[PDB]
Amino acid sequence: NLRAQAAANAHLMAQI
Amino acid sequence: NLRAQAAANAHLMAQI
Amino acid sequence: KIEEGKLVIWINGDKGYNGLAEVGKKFEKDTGIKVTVEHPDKLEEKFPQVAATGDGPDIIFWAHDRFGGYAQSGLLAEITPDKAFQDKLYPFTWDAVRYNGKLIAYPIAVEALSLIYNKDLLPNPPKTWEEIPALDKELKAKGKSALMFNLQEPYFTWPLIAADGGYAFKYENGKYDIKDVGVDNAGAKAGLTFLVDLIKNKHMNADTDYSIAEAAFNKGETAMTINGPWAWSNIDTSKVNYGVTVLPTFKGQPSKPFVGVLSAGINAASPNKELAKEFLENYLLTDEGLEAVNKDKPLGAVALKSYEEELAKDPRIAATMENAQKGEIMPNIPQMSAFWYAVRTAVINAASGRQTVDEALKDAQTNAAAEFAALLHSLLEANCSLALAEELLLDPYSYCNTTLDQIGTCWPRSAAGALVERPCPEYFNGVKYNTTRNAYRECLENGTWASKINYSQCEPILDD
Amino acid sequence: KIEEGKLVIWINGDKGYNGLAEVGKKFEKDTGIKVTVEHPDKLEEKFPQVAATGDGPDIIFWAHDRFGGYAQSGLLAEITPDKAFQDKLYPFTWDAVRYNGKLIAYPIAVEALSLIYNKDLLPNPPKTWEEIPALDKELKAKGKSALMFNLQEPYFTWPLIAADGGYAFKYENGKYDIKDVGVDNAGAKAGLTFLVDLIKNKHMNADTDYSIAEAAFNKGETAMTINGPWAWSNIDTSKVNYGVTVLPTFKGQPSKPFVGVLSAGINAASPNKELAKEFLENYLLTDEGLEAVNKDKPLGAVALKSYEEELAKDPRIAATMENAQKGEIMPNIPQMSAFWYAVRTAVINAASGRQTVDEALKDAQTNAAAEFAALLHSLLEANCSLALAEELLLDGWGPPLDPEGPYSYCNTTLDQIGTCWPRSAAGALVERPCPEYFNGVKYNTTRNAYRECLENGTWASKINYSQCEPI
Amino acid sequence: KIEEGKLVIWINGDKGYNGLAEVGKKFEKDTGIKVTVEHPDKLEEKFPQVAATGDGPDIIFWAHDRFGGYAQSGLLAEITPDKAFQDKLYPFTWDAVRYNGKLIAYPIAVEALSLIYNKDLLPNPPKTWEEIPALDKELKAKGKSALMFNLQEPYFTWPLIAADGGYAFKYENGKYDIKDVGVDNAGAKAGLTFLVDLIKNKHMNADTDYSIAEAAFNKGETAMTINGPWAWSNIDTSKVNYGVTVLPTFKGQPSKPFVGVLSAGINAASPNKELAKEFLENYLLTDEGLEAVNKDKPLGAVALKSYEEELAKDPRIAATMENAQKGEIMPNIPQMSAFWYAVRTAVINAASGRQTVDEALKDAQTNAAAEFAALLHSLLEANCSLALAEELLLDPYSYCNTTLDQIGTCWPRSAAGALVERPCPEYFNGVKYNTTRNAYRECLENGTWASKINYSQCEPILDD
Amino acid sequence: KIEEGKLVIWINGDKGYNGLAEVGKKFEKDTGIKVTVEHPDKLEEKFPQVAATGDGPDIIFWAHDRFGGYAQSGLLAEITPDKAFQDKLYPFTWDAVRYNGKLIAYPIAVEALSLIYNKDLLPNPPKTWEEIPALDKELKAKGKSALMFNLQEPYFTWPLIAADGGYAFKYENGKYDIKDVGVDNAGAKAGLTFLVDLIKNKHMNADTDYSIAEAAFNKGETAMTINGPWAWSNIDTSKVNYGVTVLPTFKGQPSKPFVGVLSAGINAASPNKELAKEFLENYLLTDEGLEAVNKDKPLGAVALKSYEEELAKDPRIAATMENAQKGEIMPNIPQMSAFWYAVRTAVINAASGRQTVDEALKDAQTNAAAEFAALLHSLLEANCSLALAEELLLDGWGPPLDPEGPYSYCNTTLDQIGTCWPRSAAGALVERPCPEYFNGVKYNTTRNAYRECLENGTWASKINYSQCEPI
Ligand SMILES: OC[C@H]1O[C@H](O[C@H]2[C@H](O)[C@@H](O)[C@@H](O)O[C@@H]2CO)[C@H](O)[C@@H](O)[C@@H]1O
Ligand SMILES: OC[C@H]1O[C@H](O[C@H]2[C@H](O)[C@@H](O)[C@@H](O)O[C@@H]2CO)[C@H](O)[C@@H](O)[C@@H]1O
């Protein structure tokens, strides 16, 4: 839900 | 509803 | 157009309209001026619709909470009683009909909700909301129920929502702060969550309305109801051995009902203002006048000192005052309509399961606080400052300086003597407008904006 | 919110605010009503900020010139004096508080600057501005100087600027032409040039202000100064054997001071308008009331006929009215504020060498200084409306806020100084970087300013700027 | 951590996972490398959760629509087949697994929904949705019903919503326009309104799911269902004399199902990429490989030329292709997840009566188009330009110019060599972050911003 | 969107775009691939606008100086030439297309300005700038003039500005110091002053541009001009018996033109990167390919070794390389763009009398012109983001839009010219008031500009500004 959402952002944040 | 709302504005608009 | 030479009065169906009409026959006998008392439904809505136009009743009766809204729209005439007449009503009832320093209606009586209960079915009524579920289970087994009251009007559920911290508008530094609504705090959630659970657990039905609850209680089918003084009369008529008492507590906190002052305002457009003033001052707000209405449906604590003195001796009136002391008097501000509409929707959607409590009270939050309008306003403010920034950058004592007016139109820096035009607003206060037409404002020769803005061409967009 | 059942009064720190509070004491004695007299700094600018939102004093006092702008904005109640009361004051004083055909304040007294000189240092004060340099050189030889007056307020320099042709707004057809501004004409240029030349030749200091000039005159250090009746009080206390006289001429032409009528206005938002009326009409506007204020700081030539008949016989008031006659009553049009601002800036920039006379007066002509400030201002306003827009968006339509956290917030606001204070929880002490720029002066942005968000979700009144120091 | 020296595969429970596992036994017999085929529930969600971390399966099977989303998150390895192997699959199945020029999975088969019907109960199936209500009334009287299909997955209702103009994303000038969603147009409304009415009128039940509908049809209790090829196998086993046919029309318009390509991607973090490549290329995408899976659950039209040639001769496969021609192949863009989630909610809320159609499809509109995010972005853009305006106004070849990065952080004009820090974002892509911590970006000595931004300190805000 | 299976090429209108299209024709003949050569106005500014969004040419051609900025922004594909191909071009030409250690374009030719003179009017061209005034006076007596060249592009004036000490960015430690700008030093001041003095004494006209100078030289009206190899072609066609020579000295010092390497870059967003590589490597970068372009407009000293060995023997190329040697290869740092902009503005303002030399070069030093444009620009950007914010707010959260009306809209956008085009229905012809200000030039705001919102909810590519005329 919002845990998988946070996880998706964290990986985008890591790349950026 | 929205007819009485429009009517309320029209009177404010008339005063202003 | 009101017929000159008569009085047409509007009052709500749950009040003593037959008592009132007899006071009308007193006036007519004395003066020869016919008095017609009517009780249209949706009274509090049907008034600003008609009165706006220059039509409707000479006089209107309703709780004071909606009178700010009429005064702002300029639909109420300014009443003019003197010292000698004001000294006969209690000062705090005068506070309730004062909008921006001006008295705008006559106070009649103080209403508060109480817990009414059947002494035969329940000799000892519950002191806390929390024990009602178990109490309903026992009563169900006898083919009865514990509690029925009107679930369709937020007025009746408000006492429970306010109990643990729920509020309408914050009162700070003299004024009510229309931007601080307390319909979505922990307290409001907890109160509303409690009501919703009673329904899931089948201790109440979400359809239950005023007439369903009244009939059930007066037939002896339910042990408790929630209502005001106007209801006692119908209970007297019925079998029911009833007691009127303080509302139950919630989380150890007293229920906080909204206290209303029944009030008589005078329609601004009516040519019968003085006749109406003579009827209310010399006929209604007398002991004979108030008694006639009261002996039809009780009024609660009346606004007249000479008649309350007696009325105060009634233990039912004591209980009405006890509950009143534990609630707030209602704000009379114009934003009250919007608050009530917001909370009505929340409770109904929450009760029916169409929305959860959290979802429901957040919508009510956003609606009651006019947050959409407040967000749009910030955008228009910002846009208007920018347009000024752009102009100044590209650039003397003769301009009209940029303003944003109450409707959201940004009047740019303009030349003295210019007739300026700007597109009608794309949205205003709930309604969309045809933006292909303009509003108009004159920048005077002296470098100040004309006081009045021509908005006559701005028409709403509606059906089809 | 103005408290009901009392009166707050704002007057300037240079005026007789103690005298006025004694008049307040008599009102309290009779009526039981507490009267508080205050004299905040920059009150003429501060009143429109606070009153515009329904706060501030019940009564404000200032020369009539700022009142037109207040009345235009809606900040003053229309006053209701009766016929008998109106006949009690000079008609020309009522004219000065008239805006759009409405009376918007009570006139109190007429003020004009005069030349004040030290009789012991200067038996015969100069008739002309042109002889001042030589006189200063003669006085330097004695460890004194010729002339010191406030250079930070255009009011004090205006008489010289107007002398040979400078004017604010051209008057004709019974009206002011706001398209006809005379601040950059040959006459205004010559007056300011003379002033700037006095500074280059070290007869005056650009930094001289009200208190430096007053102390220098009252201490016997400078033979002349320029000031109004309110200043006479502190001179009496000092030793100085002083005279008050007609201002010196420039190029043969009289100096033309702008004449002010000290006036008392009622805040439109005051719930005490009737107490206010009774105080001004029945207590202040009397021989006793005016006398009480006058004894503290002289008022000038009072609007009250019966008291003016006694004061008219003072040679200092005679001089005040001679200087007044050669000058002009100030306009009260709302544009006065922008005009004072432009001339303040032009005079200060020319005196310091920051601009030439031609550059400064041209900027004044075109209103460039006010415009630049309005440019920066709208940028700050726009940015702060945006931040508000963001908080609202998130608050109403974003993901659910934490149910356990605070419900009450102070909302995003812009203070008078240019700081945008962010949405903050009730109780929070909020830190913001000092402004990069304030009122033509740059500050260090890596120290902070402070403001409490109070217990109820309202911004505290005070904002702590004590840490913001400039370069 | 995946175990090196084995293959772990994920495929959905409705596909031929036992056929696949036999192909796994072929590989193991040949190479000695164990193949474990698993079918976890919520496969398409459980993957990016695990694969993100560097864990999960070596290979994943799902329709291509969700593969853009994995490629963007960098969870799929780039597959590398040559000319000779690509010439063996149809070109349009390769299009479906190409994200930004890169092949990211192997195409397996083409799936489309068809109308499956019981020939005994209904020898002649309806050609239009509109006649189904009457058809259900007749069947009810025989103690049956007309139509059951899965109302819990928007995939099955989409054909009806698309029929009269409903669409996901607009396709213009080469790209899909993620800002133009067609879930709230007249067509979508009309299709969804039609479904909702079938429910109010009790021709369908809102609870009906995949297993309810499958069992009812295979027991002979309902005349029609909607499903894909994987379902035919279970119908063969059952009594049912079934036909597979073209979907009904709505408002004279063909139903437009979304066409999916079943696909095998390879987990980026797995150390078994080549083993997996050898299993998919040399074992699965063979006729022997595909047949084994197909003889368990039919695949539809396969991606392999040598095997489809035969399969195309099946009239059921003809019908699957007919419906496929009338629909769109699904976009593979990352915004597909958000679209599907949006439409799933609309249909369920609309079906249950929790929301009207109009309310439901507008929420889906706003969600699918990420309009909240797009509004916030406009505000941040504006704010960032202003801050630059303010600075320039107050004022040389050595600055890093202001940027707004993908997360919404405005990097101000900065000095060459500065390590700049800015508060973490208040909101980003559905999640709120602790703004008491900062992100960090270096302005290099040469006056250009460092390519990478340190966002490591930005932590989400969640439960309690 | 760039169409797959073809090549679009952008080159400047002054270059041999017809020659290049012939090379395109040969590529098509062999491969079946259509090659389109275009030469839009302002392509160096236009390419970063369109490419930044994934549009524009597959291949762009320009001097290497703009490429560093393109590569920094992400607009160019890294090129993959092999060893054998690399040995085919001069190493110093590869150096000029190197950014961050990556090859980001193919070098084509080296360009430097030379002095071009008319042999019949001037057997012996001047060695010095200082003798030009006297020579013009001698030539005026014959109905001719001495010198005309483009005054609207700083490239043409730079050699004189650099002559006696002016520079862009100081080079040392192997790097450019972006904090060390030499556009306002004594050397730059003297060069521009000389230029401005030529105009005051009517030896040159401030308004002279590329086409006025070219026509005036090619028609025999002026004895000298300043231009690059590409210009030789049109001179051959004209009668003129011309020479190409070393630029004149200033104060004894060589003129120092900035040397450009014409280069071809591949758009990062091109789906045809491999076709592009094959075209540039195997067709253009050959004797035949270069020869085809050179025959149309001379390229200068080509990067291709084998073809440069033939061209090196032309006295015009010899002169080109002598002028190149006394000048400098341009930097390719991203700051070049701001620098060219600042100098463009300084030169134009000084030539027209709008600013003094000191004023213009100081503004150039402090980057004031670019900064002012970035200030106005961010205001327009902020306003347009706001309008977008409003439409989004209303669209998503306002009262239900009319169910009968259009579903598809073009959304609020800001065009390259500064107009914010509002949310509009598919199919609409949209009218907006002409900009108040564009590129230092004010326009009439009560006529309109026009833009179609297309059938599919996309903004049309073209915007009609034909009605916007200035004061
Ligand atoms: O239900 C919201 C409603 O509450 C109050 O109305 C009361 C009224 O005060 C009583 O006199 C009695 O008639 O019951 C009403 C509730 O049905 C507010 O006065 C009203 O404005 C509000 O809508
Ligand atoms: O300096 C500009 C200023 O002049 C006048 O202010 C006077 C005021 O009238 C006097 O009462 C006394 O206080 O000195 C002030 C000068 O500091 C105008 O009244 C005022 O509006 C204007 O800003």
Ligand SMILES: OC[C@H]1O[C@H](O[C@H]2[C@H](O)[C@@H](O)[C@@H](O)O[C@@H]2CO)[C@H](O)[C@@H](O)[C@@H]1O
């Ligand atoms: O329900 C939305 C869902 O639709 C598609 O999933 C299909 C899949 O393509 C089929 O192979 C089969 O297993 O049924 C699924 C629906 O339950 C999309 O592929 C999927 O991403 C989306 O969530």
Ligand SMILES: OC[C@H]1O[C@H](O[C@H]2[C@H](O)[C@@H](O)[C@@H](O)O[C@@H]2CO)[C@H](O)[C@@H](O)[C@@H]1O
């Ligand atoms: O004028 C500034 C300009 O100079 C150079 O442009 C040259 C270009 O290099 C030549 O190929 C020829 O086309 O003339 C141009 C002058 O107009 C820089 O390359 C360019 O970036 C800069 O703006």
